Amino acid sequence: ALLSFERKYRVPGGTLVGGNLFDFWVGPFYVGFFGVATFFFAALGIILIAWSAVLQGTWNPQLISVYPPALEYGLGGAPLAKGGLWQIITICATGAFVSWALREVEICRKLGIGYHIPFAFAFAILAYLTLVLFRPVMMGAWGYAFPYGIWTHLDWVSNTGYTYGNFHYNPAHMIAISFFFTNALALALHGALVLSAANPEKGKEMRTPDHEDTFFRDLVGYSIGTLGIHRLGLLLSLSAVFFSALCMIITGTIWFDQWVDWWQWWVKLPWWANIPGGING
Amino acid sequence: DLASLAIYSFWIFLAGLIYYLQTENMREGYPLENEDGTPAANQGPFPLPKPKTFILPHGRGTLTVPGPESEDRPIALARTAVSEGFPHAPTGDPMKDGVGPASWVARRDLPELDGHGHNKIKPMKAAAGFHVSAGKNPIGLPVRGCDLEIAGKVVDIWVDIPEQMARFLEVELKDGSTRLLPMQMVKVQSNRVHVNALSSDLFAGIPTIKSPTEVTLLEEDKICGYVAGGLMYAAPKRKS
Amino acid sequence: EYQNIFSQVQVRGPADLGMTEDVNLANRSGVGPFSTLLGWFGNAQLGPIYLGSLGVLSLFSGLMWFFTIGIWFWYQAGWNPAVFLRDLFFFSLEPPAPEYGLSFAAPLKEGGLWLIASFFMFVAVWSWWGRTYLRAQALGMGKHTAWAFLSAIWLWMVLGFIRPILMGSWSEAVPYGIFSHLDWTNNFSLVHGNLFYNPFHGLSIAFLXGSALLFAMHGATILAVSRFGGERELEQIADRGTAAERAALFVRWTMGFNATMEGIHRWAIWMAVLVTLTGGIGILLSGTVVDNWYVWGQNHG
Numbered sequence: 001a002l003l004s005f006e007r008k009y010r011v012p013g014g015t016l017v018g019g020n021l022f023d024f025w026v027g028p029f030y031v032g033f034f035g036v037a038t039f040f041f042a043a044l045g046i047i048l049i050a051w052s053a054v055l056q057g058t059w060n061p062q063l064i065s066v067y068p069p070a071l072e073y074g075l076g077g078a079p080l081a082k083g084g085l086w087q088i089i090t091i092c093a094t095g096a097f098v099s100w101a102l103r104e105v106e107i108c109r110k111l112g113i114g115y116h117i118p119f120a121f122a123f124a125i126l127a128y129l130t131l132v133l134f135r136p137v138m139m140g141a142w143g144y145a146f147p148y149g150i151w152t153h154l155d156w157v158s159n160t161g162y163t164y165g166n167f168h169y170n171p172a173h174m175i176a177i178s179f180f181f182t183n184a185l186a187l188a189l190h191g192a193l194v195l196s197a198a199n200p201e202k203g204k205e206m207r208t209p210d211h212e213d214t215f216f217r218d219l220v221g222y223s224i225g226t227l228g229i230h231r232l233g234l235l236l237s238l239s240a241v242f243f244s245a246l247c248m249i250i251t252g253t254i255w256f257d258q259w260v261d262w263w264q265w266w267v268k269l270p271w272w273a274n275i276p277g278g279i280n281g
Numbered sequence: 282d283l284a285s286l287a288i289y290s291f292w293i294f295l296a297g298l299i300y301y302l303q304t305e306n307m308r309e310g311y312p313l314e315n316e317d318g319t320p321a322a323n324q325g326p327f328p329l330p331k332p333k334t335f336i337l338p339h340g341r342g343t344l345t346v347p348g349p350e351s352e353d354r355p356i357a358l359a360r361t362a363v364s365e366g367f368p369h370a371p372t373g374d375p376m377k378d379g380v381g382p383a384s385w386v387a388r389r390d391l392p393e394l395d396g397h398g399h400n401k402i403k404p405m406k407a408a409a410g411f412h413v414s415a416g417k418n419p420i421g422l423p424v425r426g427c428d429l430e431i432a433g434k435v436v437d438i439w440v441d442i443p444e445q446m447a448r449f450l451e452v453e454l455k456d457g458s459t460r461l462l463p464m465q466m467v468k469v470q471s472n473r474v475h476v477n478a479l480s481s482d483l484f485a486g487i488p489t490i491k492s493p494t495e496v497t498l499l500e501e502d503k504i505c506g507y508v509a510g511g512l513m514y515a516a517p518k519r520k521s
Numbered sequence: 522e523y524q525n526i527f528s529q530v531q532v533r534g535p536a537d538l539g540m541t542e543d544v545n546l547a548n549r550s551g552v553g554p555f556s557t558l559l560g561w562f563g564n565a566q567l568g569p570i571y572l573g574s575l576g577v578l579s580l581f582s583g584l585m586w587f588f589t590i591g592i593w594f595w596y597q598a599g600w601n602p603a604v605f606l607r608d609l610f611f612f613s614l615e616p617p618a619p620e621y622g623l624s625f626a627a628p629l630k631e632g633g634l635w636l637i638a639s640f641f642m643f644v645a646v647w648s649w650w651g652r653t654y655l656r657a658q659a660l661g662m663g664k665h666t667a668w669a670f671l672s673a674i675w676l677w678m679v680l681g682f683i684r685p686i687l688m689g690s691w692s693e694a695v696p697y698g699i700f701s702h703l704d705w706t707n708n709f710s711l712v713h714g715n716l717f718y719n720p721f722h723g724l725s726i727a728f729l730x731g732s733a734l735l736f737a738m739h740g741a742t743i744l745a746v747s748r749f750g751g752e753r754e755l756e757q758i759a760d761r762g763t764a765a766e767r768a769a770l771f772v773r774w775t776m777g778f779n780a781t782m783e784g785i786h787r788w789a790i791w792m793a794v795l796v797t798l799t800g801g802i803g804i805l806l807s808g809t810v811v812d813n814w815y816v817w818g819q820n821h822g
């Protein structure tokens with residue numbers, strides 16, 4: 001279960017903790033300590049999801065859902081039958097996500113490569129805790145987080161967004177949107193720009209990065225390069241998630257009214273608010 | 282109905298797409314082998330792809346993949362247990378033998394050339410019209426190993442002419458010889474250049490290139506492998 | 522290490538006039554300046570841009586579309602600069618009322634100006650598509666870029682042209698405005714009973730957030746193994762180095778299934794084009810075949 005070139009890199013050492021105890025592989029997978037923890041939180045977490053399904057009375061995956069405590073519960077404990085199970089599963093899920101990222105760091109030390117992968121992962125873990133921990137703690141209730149259901153975590157996305165009118169008006173939703181649309185655009189070209197060079201016309205020789213940069217400069221008059229497009233990739237992505245955490249932690253905490261009405265400060269500025277004629281003011 | 286057909290016929294197209302994609306990521310590295318180097322029993326549930334052939338530019342032959350994979354270099358490791366999936370300890374000096382984080386690959390001992398045929402990486406002073414545009418100018422500063430001792434001084438910048446960016450730091454040691462430092466491996470500071478990966482006594486062990494006006498693909502890997510590998514296997518010294 | 526994001530040092534040589542191959546010359550303008558600001562991130566050289574027949578035709582048609590909308594914004598704004606800036610987000614060019622429908626006899630002040638701007642947009646975008654194909658063939662290159670752009674054209678043609686023709690009027694379509702094309706997107710989901718049940722909407726996100734996951738992970742990889750010169754992604758295809766060997770293993774050691782250098786881009790181009798591919802299908806079927814995705818979810822047909 002080794003690649004043609006894998007034996008040199010499978011040396012011991014580089015563990016973050018435990019020493020050579022969990023320094024081994026299982027097939028292609030690296031175990032490590034945090035692989036054991038990741039398996040522990042995930043395995044023990046799944047057990048609770050099937051148990052929550054037992055108490056609710058269904059096993060079809062489209063109906064299983066684990067809602068958090070009621071709003072009357074605040075940030076206190078809850079019975080496992082009514083929200084308390086979601087309270088534990090969230091810890092296990094958190095444990096599985098930090099153990100996954102920390103196990104990635106152990107893999108990085110072994111290969112002597114940068115820690116850019118786990119640090120990029122950290123932005124998604126921060127977006128998760130923004131919804132289930134940071135925002136509901138600021139608000140004073142767990143029932144403000146989302147439930148763990150396939151079609152029932154979309155219902156929470158719809159009810160939460162429409163509580164504040166058309167949620168398309170969040171200044172940071174807008175900004176988070178743009179990075180998301182652009183990242184797909186940015187990834188769409190870089191994928192096509194590389195393959196269109198390594199796979200030229202039928203029978204022609206492989207093209208060079210020279211041919212790549214010349215294509216962009218002919219198309220739009222600029223080329224970000226090869227080391228720059230990858231930075232643009234890492235940045236457009238973590239920026240998208242960033243504001244998708246920002247746009248949410250401000251929603252309901254520092255601002256709880258219709259987001260369309262937030263934009264009245266611009267329209268009601270003193271030097272043009274009292275200037276009629278314009279049919280939108 | 283019509284929408285159910287579009288959502289079903291697409292859930293099939295995706296299934297064939299994932300197939301096509303997952304077989305194209307089998308060109309290099311397969312066939313799988315056991316730790317002893319013989320081809321493995323089960324080799325994944327996906328067949329190997331129909332061999333594709335690249336027309337290498339400038340008439341450097343043609344690479345066809347998936348092709349016969351061989352390391353072409355002796356690997357100096359040894360089993361640490363009797364079962365698979367366990368680490369392999371090295372039987373010498375991992376940075377000189379080139380294993381673990383200090384591993385290199387036997388690429389063509391030739392240099393990468395631009396679309397016009399000339400060398401992609403030339404030393405600055407061979408590079409007509411090139412200079413330092415902004416930021417610090419590492420030429421002149423003393424490259425210090427991270428054990429806070431100094432092992433040499435930058436006596437050039439090996440630049441990339443097509444993509445105009447510094448790629449190496451021509452570092453001359455106390456015995457008058459010069460090594461190359463991967464640029465993503467040094468911290469250009471106001472009055473020194475700082476190299477996290479290595480200590481002082483390790484700069485002289487950096488692989489030495491042949492022709493002093495060009496570095497080749499195989500030579501680049503033994504250098505960047507050495508330096509990058511020194512993060513784990515160095516540790517002999519240096520803190521802050 | 523320094524987490525190779527920005528560049529410590531900047532080098533620069535003579536302006537790069539690019540390769541030639543079968544590219545008609547002349548057309549490339551004089552090279553623009555060198556911006557040190559960008560050089561910290563990517564390259565510093567601006568231009569030379571190639572402007573051909575379709576190039577001028579595209580830029581001309583686009584400025585016509587840009588102005589035809591903006592002219593209307595001044596008419597609403599009583600030709601006053603103060604109320605232009607204030608209400609800037611709110612002006613809108615709406616298409617003809619349903620009482621018209623496909624017919625081009627709509628007055629200017631009641632939908633005729635839509636089709637004027639829509640004709641410029643229609644020709645400017647396709648002029649650019651033809652441009653993205655001729656630049657690929659001119660350098661004897663693969664034409665992967667031209668097909669990926671067709672996927673984004675697909676959603677765009679479905680939104681404004683393919684669907685309004687199927688619905689029987691332009692009363693649908695999309696109006697040209699900032700705050701107004703946001704309210705349109707809201708309304709579309711409302712009238713069709715939560716686009717969330719649209720299975721193609723749900724598949725579009727999964728690929729929209731692919732793209733976020735994939736390109737976050739791939740960019741972090743090349744930077745993590747930039748220390749072995751992994752940014753030079755083509756020579757690693759033609760001759761695998763350790764930068765690609767460590768890249769395949771980290772993906773293998775962390776989640777089991779493997780990826781090559783050219784292989785991961787095969788993943789990349791599809792994970793992007795699939796966003797608008799499935800999107801256009803889910804928007805095209807919306808209203809034409811399915812009136813209410815909710816009810817569709819209750820019967821599955």
Ligand code: BCL
Nearest residue numbers: 124125127128157158160161167168176177244245247248
């Ligand atoms: C009707 C609904 C409302 C609305 C209400 C909301 C709500 C509600 C939310 C958003 C949020 C988002 N919305 Mg909005 N929004 C609407 C309209 C839109 C439109 C549009 C076309 O108009 C678009 C394109 C968007 C787009 C977006 C993004 C900006 C953002 C989602 C990304 C994100 O947070 O990732 C964050 C990333 C993560 C959460 C990933 C976490 C992953 C974890 C760490 C790992 C999981 C591993 C798992 C266990 C693996 C299992 C399998 C393995 C094999 C084991 N909205 C309308 C108006 N919007 C969200 C947001 O901003 O969040 C901050 C949000 O909460």
Ligand code: BCL
Nearest residue numbers: 046128146150153154157722723724726727728730731734
């Ligand atoms: C970010 C803004 C909102 C949000 C809004 C939406 C909307 C809107 C939609 C989804 C959709 C999906 N969401 Mg959600 N969702 C959020 C938070 C989450 C979290 C989490 C933080 O833990 C998870 C695991 C999911 C999970 C999922 C999947 C069921 C589905 C496709 C995801 C995908 O392919 O992504 C891209 C990732 C990959 C391609 C990599 C592979 C990931 C695999 C496929 C994930 C499988 C998840 C599995 C069901 C979880 C199993 C848990 C077990 C304990 C192991 N959502 C937050 C609250 N989500 C879509 C859907 O179709 O829903 C029906 C959809 O349209």
Ligand code: BCL
Nearest residue numbers: 181673674676677706707709710716725726729800803804
């Ligand atoms: C309340 C509103 C509704 C809703 C209604 C809609 C509608 C309506 C639409 C979407 C669409 C999209 N929605 Mg939804 N959606 C909602 C909830 C969500 C949420 C969420 C809450 O988390 C998310 C993340 C999404 C996610 C998404 C995307 C997957 C998808 C758009 C892909 C894209 O980039 O198109 C953007 C890409 C394009 C528009 C292509 C543009 C190509 C052209 C050629 C560009 C021309 C540029 C022009 C010339 C300008 C030049 C500028 C200068 C040169 C610089 N929806 C809710 C439930 N959503 C679309 C979709 O796929 O529907 C099936 C769509 O039409």
Ligand SMILES: CC[C@H]1c2cc3[nH]c4c(c3C)C(=O)[C@H](C(=O)OC)c4c3nc(cc4[nH]c(cc(n2)[C@@H]1C)c(C(C)=O)c4C)[C@@H](C)[C@@H]3CCC(=O)OC/C=C(\C)CCC[C@H](C)CCC[C@H](C)CCCC(C)C
Nearest residue numbers: 042045092093096100120121123124148730733734737738
């Ligand atoms: C920050 C930029 C984007 C990002 C990046 C990113 N994600 C990453 C990485 C990176 C760089 C990895 O290296 C890592 C990885 O391993 O990739 C292969 C990962 C990863 N991104 C993942 C998913 C994912 N990323 C998402 C998003 C994003 N990922 C961002 C947009 C989403 C979205 C949009 O929703 C998802 C679903 C995984 C494939 C993987 C991390 C896997 C992991 O954590 O595994 C350990 C956990 C388990 C094995 C299972 C635990 C089960 C729990 C105990 C039970 C609780 C269930 C669940 C929490 C709730 C209910 C689910 C319902 C809501 C459906």
Ligand SMILES: COC(C)(C)C/C=C/C(C)=C/C=C/C(C)=C/C=C/C(C)=C/C=C\C=C(C)\C=C\C=C(/C)CC/C=C(\C)CCC=C(C)C
Nearest residue numbers: 587590591592639640642643680681682695697698699702
């Ligand atoms: C002061 O500054 C001036 C006035 C000089 C210049 C400034 C101008 C301004 C203020 C411009 C502002 C422009 C804005 C706000 C543009 C916004 C556009 C948006 C958000 C568009 C969104 C979506 C567009 C879609 C979906 C378009 C669909 C339609 C097409 C792509 C074309 C299809 C058209 C058809 C089929 C009809 C015509 C067909 C034929 C055959 C002619």
Ligand SMILES: CCCCCCCCCCCC[N+](C)(C)[O-]
Nearest residue numbers: 220221550551552553567568570
């Ligand atoms: C959407 C494309 C718009 C054109 C952008 C061109 C950017 C660089 C132009 C180079 C300038 C050359 N010139 C004409 C000043 O000599």
Ligand SMILES: CCCCCCCCCCCC[N+](C)(C)[O-]
Nearest residue numbers: 416527528529558559561562563
């Ligand atoms: C979209 C590209 C973004 C432009 C990049 C901005 C560069 C500014 C930061 C340069 C940092 C240089 N410095 C001084 C830290 O060495």
Ligand SMILES: CCCCCCCCCCCC[N+](C)(C)[O-]
Nearest residue numbers: 299719720721723724727731792
């Ligand atoms: C390119 C394939 C990798 C991503 C595929 C996983 C995402 C699948 C999402 C399933 C969506 C379910 N549904 C019913 C909305 O279609």
Ligand SMILES: [Cl-]
Nearest residue numbers: 235238239242
């Ligand atoms: Cl950030």
Ligand SMILES: [Fe+3]
Nearest residue numbers: 194739743754
């Ligand atoms: Fe890449």
